[PDB]
Write an enzyme that holds these catalytic residues in place. Structure first.
Site, PDB file in Angstrom:
ATOM      1  N   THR B  94       0.832  -1.160   0.000  1.00 55.10           N
ATOM      2  CA  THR B  94       0.000   0.000   0.000  1.00 55.10           C
ATOM      3  C   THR B  94       0.894   1.246   0.000  1.00 55.10           C
ATOM      4  O   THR B  94       1.601   1.506   1.004  1.00 55.10           O
ATOM      5  CB  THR B  94      -0.972  -0.022   1.185  1.00 55.10           C
ATOM      6  OG1 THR B  94      -1.815  -1.167   1.047  1.00 55.10           O
ATOM      7  CG2 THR B  94      -1.882   1.181   1.159  1.00 55.10           C
ATOM      8  N   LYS B 169      -8.300   1.807  -3.003  1.00 52.77           N
ATOM      9  CA  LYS B 169      -8.048   1.495  -1.624  1.00 52.77           C
ATOM     10  C   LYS B 169      -8.042   2.767  -0.750  1.00 52.77           C
ATOM     11  O   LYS B 169      -8.696   2.773   0.297  1.00 52.77           O
ATOM     12  CB  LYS B 169      -6.775   0.691  -1.390  1.00 52.77           C
ATOM     13  CG  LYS B 169      -6.756   0.125   0.011  1.00 52.77           C
ATOM     14  CD  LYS B 169      -5.504  -0.682   0.279  1.00 52.77           C
ATOM     15  CE  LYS B 169      -5.346  -0.827   1.773  1.00 52.77           C
ATOM     16  NZ  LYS B 169      -4.265  -1.766   2.126  1.00 52.77           N
ATOM     17  N   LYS B 244      -1.285   5.483   8.643  1.00 52.23           N
ATOM     18  CA  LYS B 244      -0.500   5.376   7.384  1.00 52.23           C
ATOM     19  C   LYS B 244      -1.379   5.589   6.140  1.00 52.23           C
ATOM     20  O   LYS B 244      -1.038   6.301   5.272  1.00 52.23           O
ATOM     21  CB  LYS B 244       0.137   3.994   7.323  1.00 52.23           C
ATOM     22  CG  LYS B 244       0.809   3.715   5.991  1.00 52.23           C
ATOM     23  CD  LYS B 244       1.259   2.248   5.866  1.00 52.23           C
ATOM     24  CE  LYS B 244       1.434   1.976   4.376  1.00 52.23           C
ATOM     25  NZ  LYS B 244       1.772   0.608   3.942  1.00 52.23           N
TER      26      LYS B 244
END
Ligand SMILES: C[C@@H](CCC(=O)O)C(=O)O
Ligand SMILES: C[C@@H](CCC(=O)O)C(=O)O
Lengths: 291, 291
Positions: B94, B169, B244
């Site tokens: 990611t 995402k 994050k």
């Protein structure tokens, strides 16, 4: 059962028609002649004043715009009501106001519920409203046959004021979600991610909610959503702004910390100054007023 | 079909992912510069190598599961010249959309096929092979990659061109963060209004405000006994990890000039909470709204 219906506006008028249609004797009061006439046209016996409407009633329903008006209606009519009359307030008002009028009613020997509604005019007409109820379970049982012909859903939320609190808390979440969903679609578009692709992901993922699966603020992925119909309500910005005003009163009255709800409230208050008549999903288009 | 796969990054996601590939009959060549991670992977059948370039030298597919964009960039720089031409690189890390597209271009300039395929479902999803892969890049490359992704995956969704996986995402996770805060605010407000947690749960979940943050991740103990609130807020999905992703969302905002008022507000709230509670499930943000 004889029902006095006090407030025959855009919600009150169709609710009362469903009561007539279920075999109740409905007596009515509204200060707008056009509203009273419309209601008499569907079988409500309309009176010149609220105390007169209440005189013969077993149940008194209010559907009125503010806590102040609901309270003044209670003090205007309570002495005219018979004892153990059941009062149902379906207005959307603050928790504090709800509880004050509940206590006033019960002091007169009445039974009283807060039962604010979700579903709008459409729900009201289709008899699919969701009632969120505060009060005694035994009072709700007694009210159930009056509520049923107006309702798709009747939920007992707790003691007096719980109905108002449940609706306000749901609508504050909803508002935040509608904005977040909007931000998401605009971010995706600037990232080169198509609207259908984001829609497919979010609806199959943890971010899914009504604000996207039903109220999608971009045209295409949900052909029935307001975005495909010039943002015709649906649920107006004006009404959402009203609910958030009540959430902000509740936040101020409790000292609660509600950073995103309060932010959402400021966003919608500002948007309502220009686009009060548009569905609240239209907020997608006001995000650059923010910077 | 059975394939040789180099797996670079054998940490708490990479190790169980690699184990499922071995179970599906693939030959897995692994590298991670933390020997403890590499040892754990070897125990479940990964052939571990001395260097990343050695692991990739005889691989049809190269998977990376790495912590940041910078580490992905550095890794691609170290290994692309070592891979056989037209090796398929899948990045399931990611990372920012900008970084994704940069490494995608880098891979292609070296003659390699490349997809971004970041995952959701965490370590439990990784071990159970129920991860969702959100994929960016060419349709035909994903067709080539499907047999490799399937033994790790509960869902594979093609999101668009290179970067669209990462984009989808990060948009979903931004929405989630806002929703998790909003749900927490509602439950605290309810408590201050005297509305029970169970009653508010019942309402919201039956109404327009329903979402995973309440129905699965309920931030008060009781209504959803499996939620982290009932287990001392053990993750679940840690505040460190949400922080994050939120950072990645703010990078996407800044790179596009998008306006995301609640997403940015949610990033600020999570960045503060992460300073002392990185270790708690992100639902634990509820703590900041109470005295
Ligand atoms: C389904 C609904 C019954 C009321 C009605 O007959 O509309 C309810 O239980 O609230
Ligand atoms: C998710 C994948 C099947 C692989 C699995 O069941 O692990 C698919 O259905 O596309």
């Amino acid at each position: 059962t004889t029902i006095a219906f006090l407030g025959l506006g855009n919600m009150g008028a169709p609710m009362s028609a469903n009561l007539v249609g279920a075999g109740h004797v409905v007596r009515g009061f509204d200060p707008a002649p056009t509203a009273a006439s419309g209601a008499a046209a569907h079988g409500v016996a309309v009176f010149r004043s609220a105390p007169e409407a209440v005189a013969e009633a077993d149940v008194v329903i209010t559907m009125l715009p503010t806590g102040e008006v609901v309270r003044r209606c209670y003090t205007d009519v309570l002495a005219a009501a018979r004892p153990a009359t059941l009062f149902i307030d379906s207005s959307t008002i603050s928790v504090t106001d709800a509880r004050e009028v509940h206590a006033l009613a019960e002091s007169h020997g009445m039974l009283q519920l807060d039962a604010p509604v979700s579903g709008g005019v459409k729900g009201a007409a289709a008899a699919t409203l969701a009632f969120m109820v505060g009060g005694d379970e035994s009072t709700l049982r007694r009210a159930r046959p009056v509520l049923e012909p107006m309702a798709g859903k009747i939920i007992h939320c707790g003691a007096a004021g719980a109905g108002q609190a449940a609706k306000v808390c749901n609508n504050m979440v909803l508002a935040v979600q509608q904005i977040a969903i909007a931000e998401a679609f605009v971010l995706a578009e600037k990232l080169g991610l198509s609207a259908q692709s984001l829609f497919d992901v979010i609806t199959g993922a943890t971010g899914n909610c009504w604000a996207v699966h039903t109220n999608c603020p971009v045209p295409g992925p949900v052909p029935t959503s307001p975005a495909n119909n010039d943002f015709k309500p649906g649920f107006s910005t004006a009404l959402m702004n009203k609910d958030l005003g009540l959430a902000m009163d509740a936040v101020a009255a409790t000292g609660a910390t509600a950073p995103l709800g309060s932010h959402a409230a400021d966003i919608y208050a500002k948007f309502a100054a220009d686009h009060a008549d548009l569905d609240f999903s239209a907020v997608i288009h006001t995000l650059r007023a923010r910077a």
